[PDB]
Amino acid sequence: EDIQADATAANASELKKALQDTSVHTIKLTDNITLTSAIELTNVSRDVTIYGNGKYINATDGNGGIFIHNTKSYTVNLTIEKATLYNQSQYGFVHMNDEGTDNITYKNITAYGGTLVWSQTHVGTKTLSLEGTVNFYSVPSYTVGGQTYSTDAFKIGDTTPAIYVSNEINIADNANIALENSATKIDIWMIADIGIHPHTTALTIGNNATLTMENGNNSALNIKLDGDTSNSFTVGEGSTVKLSAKVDNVRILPYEDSNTANVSFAKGSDVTLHAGTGSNLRMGASISNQIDFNGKATFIKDSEFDYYWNDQQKTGSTGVANFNPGSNVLFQAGPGASNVNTY
Amino acid sequence: EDIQADATAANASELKKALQDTSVHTIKLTDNITLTSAIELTNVSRDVTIYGNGKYINATDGNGGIFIHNTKSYTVNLTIEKATLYNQSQYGFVHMNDEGTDNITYKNITAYGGTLVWSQTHVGTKTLSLEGTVNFYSVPSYTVGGQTYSTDAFKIGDTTPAIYVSNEINIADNANIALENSATKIDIWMIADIGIHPHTTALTIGNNATLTMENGNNSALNIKLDGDTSNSFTVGEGSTVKLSAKVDNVRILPYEDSNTANVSFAKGSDVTLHAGTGSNLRMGASISNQIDFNGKATFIKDSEFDYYWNDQQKTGSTGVANFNPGSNVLFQAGPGASNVNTY
Numbered sequence: 020e021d022i023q024a025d026a027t028a029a030n031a032s033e034l035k036k037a038l039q040d041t042s043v044h045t046i047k048l049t050d051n052i053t054l055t056s057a058i059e060l061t062n063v064s065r066d067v068t069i070y071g072n073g074k075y076i077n078a079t080d081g082n083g084g085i086f087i088h089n090t091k092s093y094t095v096n097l098t099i100e101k102a103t104l105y106n107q108s109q110y111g112f113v114h115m116n117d118e119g120t121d122n123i124t125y126k127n128i129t130a131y132g133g134t135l136v137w138s139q140t141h142v143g144t145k146t147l148s149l150e151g152t153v154n155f156y157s158v159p160s161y162t163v164g165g166q167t168y169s170t171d172a173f174k175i176g177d178t179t180p181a182i183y184v185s186n187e188i189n190i191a192d193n194a195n196i197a198l199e200n201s202a203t204k205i206d207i208w209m210i211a212d213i214g215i216h217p218h219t220t221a222l223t224i225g226n227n228a229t230l231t232m233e234n235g236n237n238s239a240l241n242i243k244l245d246g247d248t249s250n251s252f253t254v255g256e257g258s259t260v261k262l263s264a265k266v267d268n269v270r271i272l273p274y275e276d277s278n279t280a281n282v283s284f285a286k287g288s289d290v291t292l293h294a295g296t297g298s299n300l301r302m303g304a305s306i307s308n309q310i311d312f313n314g315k316a317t318f319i320k321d322s323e324f325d326y327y328w329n330d331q332q333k334t335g336s337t338g339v340a341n342f343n344p345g346s347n348v349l350f351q352a353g354p355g356a357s358n359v360n361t362y
Numbered sequence: 363e364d365i366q367a368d369a370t371a372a373n374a375s376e377l378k379k380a381l382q383d384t385s386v387h388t389i390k391l392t393d394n395i396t397l398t399s400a401i402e403l404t405n406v407s408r409d410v411t412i413y414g415n416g417k418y419i420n421a422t423d424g425n426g427g428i429f430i431h432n433t434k435s436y437t438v439n440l441t442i443e444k445a446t447l448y449n450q451s452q453y454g455f456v457h458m459n460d461e462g463t464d465n466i467t468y469k470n471i472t473a474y475g476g477t478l479v480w481s482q483t484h485v486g487t488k489t490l491s492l493e494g495t496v497n498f499y500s501v502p503s504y505t506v507g508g509q510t511y512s513t514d515a516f517k518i519g520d521t522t523p524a525i526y527v528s529n530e531i532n533i534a535d536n537a538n539i540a541l542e543n544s545a546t547k548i549d550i551w552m553i554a555d556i557g558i559h560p561h562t563t564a565l566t567i568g569n570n571a572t573l574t575m576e577n578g579n580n581s582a583l584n585i586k587l588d589g590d591t592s593n594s595f596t597v598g599e600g601s602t603v604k605l606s607a608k609v610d611n612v613r614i615l616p617y618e619d620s621n622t623a624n625v626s627f628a629k630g631s632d633v634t635l636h637a638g639t640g641s642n643l644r645m646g647a648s649i650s651n652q653i654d655f656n657g658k659a660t661f662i663k664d665s666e667f668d669y670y671w672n673d674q675q676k677t678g679s680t681g682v683a684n685f686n687p688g689s690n691v692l693f694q695a696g697p698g699a700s701n702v703n704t705y
Binding site: 312328329331333336337338339340341342343344345346347348349350352356357358359360361 | 655671672674676679680681682683684685686687688689690691692693695699700701702703704
């Protein structure tokens with residue numbers, strides 16, 4: 020049954036006012052919205068959900084659609100559901116700065132942009148959680164409302180992310196997540212190296228969920244984890260993951276030393292990784308690199324440098340693979356390649 | 363330079379007398395010897411080396427050539443070097459019974475037989491050590507001295523070993539060991555389940571050594587370890603191992619529970635395992651099953667039951683593979699097969 024939203028928004032001004040009002044916890048879009056300026060949140064804590072109501076929001080500003088920049092005592096729990104989100108900004112539709120705790124949730128969202136979600140990586144705790152059907156399109160441009168808009172992407176010495184979130188990316192139970200990349204080099208890039216937040220990265224997939232990032236025609240890397248202290252990539256029970264990339268599917272090589280790295284696939288999961296010239300799993304944490312297999316896994320390799328010897332590469336000295344009941348692992352590679360190698 | 367042997371032996375009688383004399387520690391063969399009765403050692407400790415002097419010993423008796431059956435306080439350190447040894451007995455050329463500690467050493471030995479070395483597995487500590495060039499031929503018959511002799515092989519519910527030694531088989535540094543099997547089902551079978559000896563099996567290969575047991579046309583298993591408490595197969599630095607079998611290369615499935623199993627390949631080693639229908643490594647110890655990779659390893663699978671899903675099978679729940687610097691592992695298998703599976 021139904022409930023009344025705290026505000027409605029039919030344009031940019033009403034959306035801004037509702038989002039900046041601390042008394043407003045729910046916002047229903049009553050029309051498609053074009054944001055010509057980023058809606059800023061600063062010196063403020065907010066718990067708020069935007070009910071998209073099948074509408075779109077097209078953010079055309081250089082800072083994004085929603086630009087959060089709080090100091091360390093503020094917390095923003097921002098949810099956007101049932102909407103299409105477009106953004107031109109190199110800092111994504113949701114743009115997160117500074118030491119505030121920012122917890123973004125997308126549910127039933129279709130998103131277009133170059134860089135689609137972006138957070139600073141040297142300051143506060145930044146998380147992105149994904150529910151229901153979420154379809155990310157990293158594109159060079161998009162067309163909406165009769166007009167065409169070029170995207171932009173955050174750059175680091177020739178390298179660009181589609182999703183750039185520091186500490187956590189969570190995919191909920193039963194979610195179905197897809198990212199189709201035709202504009203950026205790394206699908207998912209998480210850095211957590213210095214700052215008040217834990218220096219930790221985790222891409223966590225829940226149960227009966229799917230993640231599909233079939234970008235072997237475009238992306239260099241599907242997942243890059245750069246957590247100073249620890250790095251985890253975990254797939255829950257009965258979940259299905261399919262990743263393809265030109266170089267590595269999962270790259271965990273933190274600049275730094277004194278780090279751990281963990282990859283775990285739970286019972287009933289089905290994981291397929293396809294790499295072109297690099298590795299399905301390239302792990303170089305200094306303390307330990309651990310893979311826990313509980314399910315079905317298929318690693319495919321066609322043939323820090325962009326080429327490798329092996330499906331799994333421990334480029335940072337020393338690896339451990341655990342095989343528990345339910346485990347069923349197959350490595351496929353071309354002539355002269357190895358399946359597990361150390362560097 | 364030269365030394366005087368304590369005895370010479372030119373026939374069966376002189377060999378028997380020298381072997382049974384506790385004052386004799388070295389014996390030089392001065393002619394080929396045919397043993398029509400097994401030379402027994404009982405109620406006696408002996409430290410003795412037979413210097414074969416390029417001669418042969420053909421043991422035709424049902425109990426073997428040398429039959430050791432001591433109680434627990436006696437110890438036999440028996441070495442045979444630079445000789446060809448033939449045996450008709452199902453209990454091998456050297457036949458070891460009861461609770462005595464028996465340590466056999468072969469150096470520069472060529473051996474023909476069905477079962478070539480055999481020890482009881484429920485009593486004393488039984489070891490076989492191998493130095494220099496040792497060539498084992500498990501054959502249905504042999505011809506020597508103008509006559510032809512049929513071999514016999516120890517049987518256990520349809521299954522026969524070429525080498526059946528309870529606790530240790532040691533291959534020394536720089537040794538080159540080969541076993542060509544055309545008469546028995548299991549190349550090397552070690553059982554240590556009950557009794558006063560430790561319930562442990564270990565096939566230990568030293569450094570810069572080789573083991574070649576290319577019997578994919580004949581043998582079911584290359585190595586079967588059945589130690590109640592622990593089971594190890596270790597290959598030392600810079601050593602080369604090539605094994606081929608119809609079913610499993612290494613099978614470690616002790617009947618029993620509360621056991622560990624360890625397979626380790628040291629740095630610079632080169633290990634190639636080729637299995638037909640079973641696994642390169644079939645490990646089912648109850649506590650733990652651990653593989654340490656430090657070198658180059660190639661596992662080949664063409665396609666307790668005789669067929670498997672996987673190059674490595676943990677049929678006893680739970681496995682761990684460690685990959686250390688120098689590790690370079692490749693699994694090869696046919697369509698529908700896995701590389702690591704659990705049962």
